[PDB]
Amino acid sequence: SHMEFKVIAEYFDKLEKISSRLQLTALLADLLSKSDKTIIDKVVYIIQGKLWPDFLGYPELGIGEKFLIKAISIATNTDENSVENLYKTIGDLGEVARRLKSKQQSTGILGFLGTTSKESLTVDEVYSTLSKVALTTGEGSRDLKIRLLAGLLKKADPLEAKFLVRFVEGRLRVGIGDATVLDAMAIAFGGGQSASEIIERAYNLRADLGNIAKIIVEKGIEALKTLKPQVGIPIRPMLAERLSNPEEILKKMGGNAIVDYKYDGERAQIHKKEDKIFIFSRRLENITSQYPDVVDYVSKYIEGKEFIIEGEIVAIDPESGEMRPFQELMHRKRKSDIYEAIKEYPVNVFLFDLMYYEDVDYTTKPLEARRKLLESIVKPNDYVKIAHHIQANNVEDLKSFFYRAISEGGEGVMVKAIGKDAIYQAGARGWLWIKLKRD
Amino acid sequence: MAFKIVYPNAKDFFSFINSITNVTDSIILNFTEDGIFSRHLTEDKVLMAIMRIPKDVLSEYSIDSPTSVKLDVSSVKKILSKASSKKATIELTETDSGLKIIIRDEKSGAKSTIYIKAEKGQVEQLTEPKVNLAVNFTTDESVLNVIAADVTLVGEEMRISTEEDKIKIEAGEEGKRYVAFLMKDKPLKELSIDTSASSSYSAEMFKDAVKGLRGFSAPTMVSFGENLPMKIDVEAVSGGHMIFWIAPRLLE
Amino acid sequence: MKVVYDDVRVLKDIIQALARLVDEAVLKFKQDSVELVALDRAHISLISVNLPREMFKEYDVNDEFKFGFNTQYLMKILKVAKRKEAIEIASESPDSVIINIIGSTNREFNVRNLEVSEQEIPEINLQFDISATISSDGFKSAISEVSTVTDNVVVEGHEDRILIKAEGESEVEVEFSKDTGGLQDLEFSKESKNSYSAEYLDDVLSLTKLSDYVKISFGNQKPLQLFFNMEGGGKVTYLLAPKVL
Amino acid sequence: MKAKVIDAVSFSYILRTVGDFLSEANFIVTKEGIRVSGIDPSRVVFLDIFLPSSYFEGFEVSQEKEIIGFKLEDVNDILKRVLKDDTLILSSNESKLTLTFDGEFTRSFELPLIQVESTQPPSVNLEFPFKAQLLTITFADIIDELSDLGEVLNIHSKENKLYFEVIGDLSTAKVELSTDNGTLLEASGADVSSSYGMEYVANTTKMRRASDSMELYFGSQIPLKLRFKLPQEGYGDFYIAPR
DNA sequence: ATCAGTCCGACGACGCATCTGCACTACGAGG
DNA sequence: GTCGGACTGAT
DNA sequence: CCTCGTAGTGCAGATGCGTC
C-alpha cells in the first residue's frame, strides 16, 4: 500500500557489487530487518523469483523470449524487428529494453486530454498484477496477457526497467541463493548464530518458505521445534557426493555396511492423510496429473495411517524382466492420454525408506529403524520391489556384486551410511549416501 | 499498349491462380496473339499445370509484343484472397513498378488495386503432350475429391480396371482394400469406353490435382490410356482451359 | 431493476469489442442511459459504449448498480442462444447478481460481483479533419485486405477519397471514392497522413454488423476515433492513438 | 452375416461417439441382437450397446455365435468418411471386417479381425430412487450449454423433480427443469443428491442422431444411469459412477 | 607456501504442450 | 544433471 | 431450390516449459 518498488530496486542495485558471501549476507539481513510485515512473504517470493512454490501444482507462466520481444516493442512504441536484431546482438534483454525508456518514451492516449495522477509503483500491486497475469489462460489468451504485461512494463522507470525482464526469465542474476537468505534471517531475527539450526529444520519440515517466514516475523524464533513433519508440503530427498570405488567405503563405515543398488528414474514422494494423495517430484511440483495410476498402489500395498515414503519412476519391459531407458520413459510423462501407453509402460514404485508413518517425528533416527520398517509394511508382489539387501564379505565379494549388476545392466551400486548420528537429514551433500559412477 | 486484359469472373481467376500455386511458388504467364497461355511443371514432372485462356473471355486485349512477366506467388496470394462479388471486374496493366492488379467489386462498391514487382521476359510456344487416350469421359466434380479422400487412407497406389467397359477402382494395400464401380452415368454424366487397360497412377498427386477443382462449376473432361499419362480437361465457367497430366512411374 | 432484452445477439458484439480490449470494467447503470466506459491497461485504447434504456422490453432502473464480471467468463455463457431468445437479469443484494437465460428451459446463474477500481477518463472535445461515412461492412474488406501481410496501417485524407494503404513488402492501396460505392458524406478540412497499430485496428472489427454507416473522425495531430450508430442513437465511442510517435 | 442399415449417418455417429470412452470393442452376432458391451480403461463408466433384428432392413443371419472385434481408430476414421443418408451395407468375414457403402454409387472397405475378448459386465439391478423422461434435443442443449465452466456437476433431485445445478467459485449454474417448463412428464421420486465430473457426462452428448428420447435413473452414491433410446427397440447405456 | 570440502548457477537441445491462424463445412435464414 | 568452477577454512 | 454466413472444426504453424 504505502510501500514502493523503488527501495527493493535500489537494494538490488547494491546487490551485484559484493562477491564476499560474508558481506552480502549482512546487507541482506539489514534489508530484511528494515522490511515491513504483511508483505514480507511476498517480498521473499520475489527474491527467489517465484510467485508461488510449485508444490501447489499451479500451471507455469507462458511468457518466453519472442513474446517478451513483441511486448517490449509494444510498450516502447518501437520497431519489433529492431529489438529482435538488438537481442541478437546483446545477450541481456534487460539492457535491450533499458535504453528504450530514457531517450524516447511512449505517448499513449492518457495525457493529451489532461490528467496528472501517477506515482511510484509498489511491490504489492505489482505482485498482485503478476499473479493475475500468471495463469489467466482462457481462449483469447495471449493478446490480453501480453497487453497487460507490456503495460505494466511501461508502468515503470528507466532504471528499474531492467530487473523485471529477468523476473520473467526464470532466474535472478544477483547470485544470492536460498541458504544465504536462511542464514541472513537467522542472523537478523535470532541475533545469534544458534538460531540457524531451527531455521534449517523448519525448511526441512515443509517445502514452503513464505509461511515459515511469516510465522517467524509474527511471534519469534520459538514455537517451531515441536512442529512435526506433517503429511502435506513435500520434503526433498537428501543429496550426496560423487566419487570412485576405492578401498574407502569399508573403512569409512568402520564395520558391516548396508550394500544397496543404484536405481534410476525420477524420484517419488507421497503425502497421504488417509483421504487424498499428494505426490511431489524430485523437484517441488505435483506429478499426479501425469501419474494417475501410481496413487493407487500406495493405498493397497502400503498399510497403516498417514505415511511418507520416497520412491523412483523407471519403466519395465513388458515381455519379461528387463529395464528400459529413461529417454524412452520421457515420452510417457507428457500426455493426458494415459490409457494408451501407461499400461504398456510398467513402472515399479521402488521403496528405499519409510520416512514419516507413526503420526510423530521419525526422521531423527538411525539407518536401521527405517530399513526394518520398510520390510514389514509391504505386500508380496512383483509390481513393487524393495532394497535388495545383499551382504558381502570383502571387496572381492563387493566387486562380485558390481559384476552381477553389470551383467544385469542398470546404473550400478550405491551404498548408504549407517550410524548413531548418521541419519537421513534434509540438505547439504554429506557422507550419509555415497553414489558410485565411472566411465 | 503492352498490358491490357480484363476478366469477367474474379472467382474463376483466383481459382486459376490457386490451382497453379498449389503446384509451385513461381508464375509463368506468356501473352501473345492467341491471348494468354501459361505452363508450370514440378521438378519430378509427375503433374502438369497449364492455364490456357481463349481470346474471347478478355473484354479488352491490347499488347505490343509477345512477352512474359516473371511473376511469383509468394505473398500476393493472401493479398488477393480478398476478391469477391462473383464476377467482379478484374484487370491487369503495365507499370514501371512491375505489375498492378485492379479488382473492383460492386457488392459494397470498393476498388482493390495492388502493386507487384516483376519484370518482363520471353514467350514460349504452346507446349502440350500429344497422345491417343482411347478411354475418355467428363464427370461430376465432387466424385474426384471423393476418390481422393477415400483412397488416401489405404495407401498410395491408384489402379483403375475398366474391363468390359465396367469401371473398377482397386488401390491401397492388400488388407485395407477398396472396391468401387462407375457404370454408365449412374454417378457420372458422360462416359466413353474404347479400350480396357490398367492405370497404376500416383494417388497422392491425384489428391493434389483434384485440390484444384473447387469452384469450376462445370463437368470436367477426363481421359487416359494403358499406363499412359492421364488427362483431365476443365472448361472454366467464365473462360480458360487448365488440364491435368498424371505422369506415371512405369510399372514399379 | 430487472432487465430483459428480447435479443441476445446485440449482447454478443458489445462483449467481443469489450473482451480483449480490457480485462474488467464497470457497468454504470444510470437512470437515463447505460453508461459503460472501459479504458485499457495498455492506455493505447479507449472504448466507450452508450445504449439508451429502451432496447429492453421497457425495463426501468431503481438505483446505481455495479455488476462486475470476467470478460472471458462473461462471453463464455452468452454464446448459448443462436435462435430468437432473450435473457432476464436482476439482483437485490450488492454482492450477488442473478442472470437468467430464458426462451428455452430457463437457465439462471448467480455471478459473484467483483470489484475493480479505475479513474474517470476525461471527456473528448477533439475536432477532426476527416468525416467519412463509408460502407461499414466495407471496412471489413479494407482491413482484412491491408493488414493481412503488413504490421502497420497508414491513412491519407485525400481530396475526395479515403487513401488507406500499408507500404513495406508491397503497397496495398484501396479506395472508396464517392462515385462507385464508397463515401456518402465527407468533410475534407485539411490534408492528413497518419498511421495506426496493426492489432488495435483488428480487434475492433467484429462489432460491425449492428450499424451500417460508420463516421471515422480523425486528422493530423489527432488520434483515431470512430463510432457506429446503434438503435436509438447508439454511441459506441472507440479511440486509438497513432503508432510510432 | 450381412447387414444393411438404412442410416449410414446415425450408426456411424453413435459408434464414433462411443469410440471416445473405449479403445476396443467386440461384436457378438447372435439370433436376435449383436451386442457391444465394453468396459472403460478407467473402470469408471461401463457402457453396453445392443441392436435389434429390425434396425437394418435386408439383414442376414448366418451363425449364432459370430464374435468379432476391431481396432477403434480404423473403424472410426473409415466411417468418418460417410457422405449422406446412403444405404450402407455390411457383410461378415470369418477373419476380417467387410464394409460396402451403397449410395449414389458403390463403395467398399476392408478391415482385419483382431483377436480380443474380455467380458466383465457389472450387473447393476440397482434401486434408483428416481425415474424421469426427457427428449434428446433438450438434453443435449442443456448439457452443452454450461459445460465450459469447470468440472463441478451435482444432479440434485426433489419430490418427482429432476434438476441440474453447477456450482463454481465465481459463478453458479441453476437449470430449473419441471414438467411445467420443459421436462416432458412422468416425474417421480424424492429429494436426493449426487455429483459427477463434467467432461465424463459431457462427451456423451453426441447421441443426437439415432435418437427418439431418453430416460434418467439415479440416486445418491449410486451409479448414475443414462439410457439413450434408439429407434425400433434400440438403446445404448452410459453407466457412470458418482465421485 | 600449499590441500578438502563446498556453494551455485550456465547448457542449450530440445518432445510435446497450447494458442493462433486459417481454410473448409454442415446447417440455419430468408428470397 | 552436470561439470565446472569459484569460495571457505587449514599446517 | 438458391443464395449467403457463421459458428464450429480440423490442420498446419508458431513459441515456450522442464529435463538434464
Ligand SMILES: *P(=O)(O)OC[C@H]1O[C@@H](n2cnc3c(N)ncnc32)[C@H](O)[C@@H]1O
Ligand atoms: P540420477 O538419475 O543418477 O539419480 C536420480 C535420483 O535417484 C536416486 N537414487 C539412485 N540410486 C539410489 C539408491 N541406491 N538409493 C537411493 N536413491 C537413489 C538419487 O537420489 C537421485 O536423486
Ligand SMILES: [Mn+2]
Ligand atoms: Mn513448473
Ligand SMILES: [Mn+2]
Ligand atoms: Mn512461455
Ligand SMILES: [Mn+2]
Ligand atoms: Mn538415479
Ligand SMILES: [Mn+2]
Ligand atoms: Mn519458462
